């Protein structure tokens, strides 16, 4: 800003940056899809685990 001699447009873009200081807000979207996926995955994981464990002792 001290480089520019036309400064009153550096004050403008400073205020534009500080205005638009939120440049995009938070994204958490893995909280609906992750749980659904986890239920089916857990079910299948446990089923396989139990089946083969049973077979091991068999």
Partner 1 sequence: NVIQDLYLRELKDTKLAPSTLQDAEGNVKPWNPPQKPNLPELELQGPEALKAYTEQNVETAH
DSSP 19-58: HT--SS-----TTTHHHHHHHHHHHHHHHHHHHHHHHHH-
- For partner 1, which residue of 11, 13, 45, 51 counts as binding (CB under 8 A)? 13
- Is 53 a binding residue for partner 1 by CB under 8 A? The answer is no
- For partner 1, which residue of 1, 21, 29, 57 counts as binding (CB under 8 A)? 29
Q: Total residues contacting partner 1 (rule CB under 8 A)?
A: 21
Supply the minimum distance, in Å, between the C-beta of residue 58 and partner 1: 18
Could you say which DSSP state residue 22 is in?
Answer: -
């Amino acid at each position: 800003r001290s480089v520019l001699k036309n400064t009153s447009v550096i004050d403008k873009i400073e205020s534009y940056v500080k205005q638009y200081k939120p440049v995009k807000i938070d994204a958490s979207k893995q909280l609906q899809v992750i749980e659904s996926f986890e239920k089916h995955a857990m079910t299948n994981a446990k089923e396989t685990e139990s089946l083969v464990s049973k077979e091991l002792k068999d």
